[PDB]
Swiss-Prot record, chain B:
InterPro entries: ADP-Glc_PPase (IPR011831), ADP_Glu_pyroP_CS (IPR005836), GlgC_bac (IPR023049), GlmU/GlgC-like_hexapep (IPR056818), NTP_transferase_dom (IPR005835), Nucleotide-diphossugar_trans (IPR029044), Trimer_LpxA-like_sf (IPR011004). Its EC number is 2.7.7.27. The keyword Nucleotide-binding applies. It is an enzyme of class 2 (transferase). Alpha-D-glucose 1-phosphate binds at Y98, G163, E178, K179, S196. GO terms for biological process: glycogen biosynthetic process. Keywords: ATP-binding, Carbohydrate metabolism, Glycogen biosynthesis, Glycogen metabolism, Nucleotide-binding, Nucleotidyltransferase, Transferase. The keyword Transferase applies. GO terms for molecular function: ATP binding; glucose-1-phosphate adenylyltransferase activity. Homotetramer. Gene3D superfamilies: Hexapeptide repeat proteins, Spore Coat Polysaccharide Biosynthesis Protein SpsA, Chain A. This is Glucose-1-phosphate adenylyltransferase. Involved in the biosynthesis of ADP-glucose, a building block required for the elongation reactions to produce glycogen. Catalyzes the reaction between ATP and alpha-D-glucose 1-phosphate (G1P) to produce pyrophosphate and ADP-Glc.
Length: 409, 411, 409, 415
């Protein structure tokens, strides 16, 4: 009779340590990692909730949340309770004992709002999805939990929490990374991979997590304790990402990215420099909100036979001054200073980085605020680079300031 | 002890047609004209008021002000009355419009009175400059003047096109002259003259009766520069305040910066000079920021790198949400949202927001109005007689391009 | 599945004079008249749009617009275009030569948004409605216009532009203020009363308006020209208020008021003093947004035999100081200051009113900011009362500052 | 130089808000003292924040600690209007920057040097965030640079009998501090005017340069309790120059406030008194002074509604202060102060009651000389203020007969 997103509350689990992103997540959680030239990773789930019409949002934080909390304070500050909206930042006596405990310790935050539906969201993935489709299916199916799932070729799901399904898209088994992922009935060769997105009726959810906290035997996680429990003792249904995903007209397939490794993080950002990227960051119909300040425009200067500031096949944010520096196939976040006779290629450059004169960097990820000393060469000597910085097996160097300062060169 | 701006209300006069900007001000008052890549002209005076600590701002607008008013509604929306801040947009009505710039104040006494400020800072809303108004506020009460007037220190040859302040040894105004052929020089500093910036400071009580006396005078032109100021220069006490004293000069600004941008060449030159390696105006300054209306936009993007086409910008300023797809930019300033397409070329171009450049177009020495769609293959800057017959072209060689003109050509 | 509000624009008509409110609207448009103790009239239509899910709103203004426009600038300032929200104030040859011209002159504001549906609203009524219902009837009905109608007893409708329908609620004729109004077939005694709420497909509305500006015989009005044009040539289906009205559990009937006359304005505000008011201003599930400031609480002072500052069976806003004044069956907006030995009864007191000592006013509407001189008496001399101020037949006095200024006797 | 621009442009206010409100007992059990409500809408911390705002300080940092959940949430929702590109900043700084908490009140600044120094403020204004007072810090800033002092301290001029509970500053003819004693049993006196002493408000103005010096060389010394008044301040009064700034010179008074207002509300009786005092005809604190307004977090709420007038119930407030969204239904209120959302029902009576937000007073309940905690649902027929011995056993009753009532005591309730 009315749209269901009115009665929904998005609960964002943003306690991801990153870990596999190494120094990139040393002083910040993975949802706080920058992506795309402007936003952060957590901005996609939050914008999905906003654009789906969900007016109540909770975000549970955990590992090194100081930068994430400050981002959510400064950027997602426009919710007003008297308009029936709310944005609750819910940081962790001591740590949360998992991710279902992240919902248990904040019952007294949710239950005052009395939402009828809770949309449990992973806050460390890049994707655009209309959660109204997932809410309608949860009501129409009468399930205890609806789980969003990717349709992935049956060889990529080997590194995924895979749900096996029958012909009515009801989940009959969950397997953590099966060696031979079970396929879709009548559509073998594709398996359903878990997105970490679950829809519950709130009364059912409050009861389920409460039983979990009364189980000293439990690890207090949705995927290892809660989700297997309804899969076996109850009713679980799968929601396919392709049904809910919001595709631009310049998007060639449903887009979802885990950016779990340094190589995957690098590839997802550099792919935005392509002629027609997989992710349309120019889409106005399903916009991504984030914290942004009014910045001066980007500037390209110098044009001698010695030095020319210019960008080619590149994405350049505002407040960037490209002073006699050559940029090719590079993505620059806000406020980057590149100085004369320097050159960057295949570089993901996080905000407020300064490139010293005569430096030459190839196939790199430069962390926030790093000052690259004058004349530094990266991407030329693999063994020297693997000694000075963190180098992936395909030649991408993660460069942090603590690596830079520990060089007598 | 206490700062004077706490008890001051900046009153910005924003009803300037800027007639000599021609089609650039067709449907837009001069304070609403875009400048510098992101801001509009009126944002400088308002940002000077804010950064000087003046928490009450009134903006008087006149002709074709819908786009200016919407800018003020959207960009300057953060003032809170219960924190003793206010931002009043005061368009003419609430019999015709404002009879003059002094009537612009007079019609709005009942807006000014409830605030009861002790000082009134009358600002021109159509100039580009940075200034700390507390210095001027400080000189006013220490001088006992009836009005303090902000003045540029310009060489006498260039002061001939200004309203010039004749000043004695105490910088007291003994005569005001409209565009003198031989401008009176500063005593002891001949060769320089004092040119009015249109910045005034009054005690609010003094100002209210002046404009009320001006309103009860049928002879009056109802204008500050013609009726109120020349009245004080001879019957009251008028003192000049020197812009060099109060100008907020960035460390990378070689001189006090003030631009009128009163003609198309002057508007073009002021914008295009921000592409210098060291510009006169520092748009990367944080100590005295210029606030404006801005939205979150995607970054600028450059695509294609062939021998046929290469998207790139050299010696240029490029705002966000600009897609430079196989287009070659040189010495150009692009506002937000520009789409430049394959095989096109821009040189010495000021390109206002949301302009599309079609493939194979080549434009040199241009000002392209907001939202203009340049047809594919158009050439500007190559045939002066053809460009002048097609567009508004200055005698210096700069074309102003509007969509009306583009729609008016088979050729 | 998708809510239709996501793709609609609410276009509020707020250029009304409210002439039978007399000096209450001498310097304000009727949509800017205060109502309820904190809000103004137009806030209800705007809140209905916001709560229905509509985030693109345009408000056309005309007569006495400054305080209305200043109200919209500072109260409805939280919309952000890059979140696909918009709020346009449209005071945009002289004025609006009608009401259909109010849209025609602002097509250049509308069709760039390219909304799929237009919801044309009257901005001078007090009501709570979910516009998703009428949108969800419009696109299923396939009509060229859905018109919101109140089902009123047939002798109330004599002041309405009345339409009658068949068994399928299809509008066959439109009669403006019928002396003997046509009743609904089958169940007569009641009639459909048009509320001035129109729903269109945007592409249809644009043509209907441009063909209405083509005809020179046109008064350029919806209800007078375009609306009767479609029921004669196109398809119109009425929509019943009771199906869409948002009623609290404490509102015993669908609430809608016109407050067209001073007596009707007084009545609607004073009825809020009831124990069980017809309008529940405490319904948080459909809240009315307005311009509001942080204000001090209400203060009640003095308690002697001669003076006692207190309010009984009244509604008192913040920043109100009831100092030795006795209030009874009154409603006070923010900022009122009633001083010692004064007495108010059956009074609607607009913001910032000052009641001097010993003043005793009864059955009045006091205009915004009026200073009541000490010892003034109203309500005891019906003959003297009509001579100083404006008295209705029922004996309600509207008091403005100008009436007080001219008071010798 | 200048001598024209205000010093506040180059200052940053650092609000210490990590206190426990020790003697407020159950009122600060799940709130820090800066988060305790005061006045009818605002919380205690809003006064120091508003003083900084209205003084011209656009850079604020708030250090939190003990049970900071609702305090931090209050700061996120209310104090959210600062924009860094306008040279404004509001930093919420919880104690997670190391080992457990902040070692002290000076540790709260040293742990956050990395946030302070990029701003590069010229002057540091250290504020206690648990006092009710209105003050223009610009007077203190300008005094600091004309004095050449190392630290300037805000001081209350109180009779020496009352200065026995404060940190007392011993000054000379030039109000230059000679000594500091922690709560002297017989405090020293001011030259030219003894019978009075200078008591520390906990307000310190530093040159940021030297403060960073004093804080870094205070972390690397295990002799220090890592506090300003206990460790930093006494160091300067000995090795440098410490000057006393008197609240009477910078206090912002209304036309309706007859004396420099400063309250500590450190106990339940003091807290109850400070709120009830607002119901007086001429209050000591003028909450209607719009020249120095107190900003806080507030929502659009419905008005206050009074209803019923029979022979035995009449909803009415007398000599009281009633906030919005209050429905006084057949309830009589006298000498009370009600925050937001309070629901008082028929035949109930309140006298001398400070009623925090969203309290519900049940029918026939009669309460006298009480402080009711936020959200407490008073059961029907409850009688408080009638039986001193039984009220003392059921609730937190003060030595002067004020009962603090929390929900943790309404549930635990018997004969």
């Amino acid at each position: 009779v009315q749209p269901l997103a009115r009665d929904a509350m998005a609960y964002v689990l943003a306690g991801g340590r990153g870990s596999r992103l190494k120094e990139l997540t040393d002083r910040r959680a993975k949802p706080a990692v920058y992506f795309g030239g402007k936003a952060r990773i957590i901005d996609f789930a939050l914008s999905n909730a906003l654009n789906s019409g969900i007016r109540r949002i909770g975000v549970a934080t955990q590992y090194k949340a100081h930068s994430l909390i400050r981002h959510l304070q400064r950027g997602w500050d426009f919710f007003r309770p008297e308009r029936n909206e709310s944005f609750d930042i819910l940081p962790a006596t001591q740590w949360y004992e998992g991710t279902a405990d992240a919902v248990y310790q904040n019952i007294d935050i949710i239950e005052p709002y009395a939402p009828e539906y809770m949309v449990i969201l992973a806050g460390d993935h890049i994707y655009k999805m209309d959660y109204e489709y997932m809410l309608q299916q949860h009501v129409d199916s009468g399930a205890d939990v609806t789980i969003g799932c990717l349709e992935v070729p049956r060889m990529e799901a080997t590194g995924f929490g895979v749900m096996h399904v029958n012909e009515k898209d009801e989940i009959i088994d969950f397997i953590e990374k099966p060696a031979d992922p079970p396929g879709i009935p009548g559509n073998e060769g594709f398996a359903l991979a878990s997105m970490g997105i679950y829809v519950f009726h709130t009364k059912f959810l409050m009861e389920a997590l409460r039983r979990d906290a009364a189980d000293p035997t439990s690890s207090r996680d949705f995927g290892k304790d809660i989700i297997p429990y309804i899969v076996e003792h109850g009713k679980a249904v799968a929601h396919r990402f392709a049904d809910s995903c919001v595709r631009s007209d310049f998007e060639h397939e449903p887009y979802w990215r885990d950016v779990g490794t340094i190589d995957a993080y690098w590839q997802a950002n550099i792919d935005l420099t392509d002629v027609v990227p997989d992710l349309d960051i120019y889409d106005k119909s399903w916009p991504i909100w984030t914290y942004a300040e009014i910045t001066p425009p980007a500037k390209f200067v110098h044009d001698d036979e010695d030095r020319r500031g210019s960008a080619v096949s590149s994405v350049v944010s505002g407040d960037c001054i490209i002073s006699g520096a050559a940029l090719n196939r590079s993505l620059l976040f806000t406020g980057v200073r590149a100085n004369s006779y320097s050159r960057l290629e295949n570089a993901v450059v996080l905000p407020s980085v300064k490139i010293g004169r005569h430096a030459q960097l190839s196939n790199v990820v430069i962390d926030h605020g790093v000052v690259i000393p004058e004349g530094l060469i990266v991407g030329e000597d693999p063994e020297l680079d693997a000694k000075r910085f963190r180098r992936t097996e395909s030649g991408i160097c993660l460069i942090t300031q603590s690596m830079i300062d520990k060089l007598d060169l």
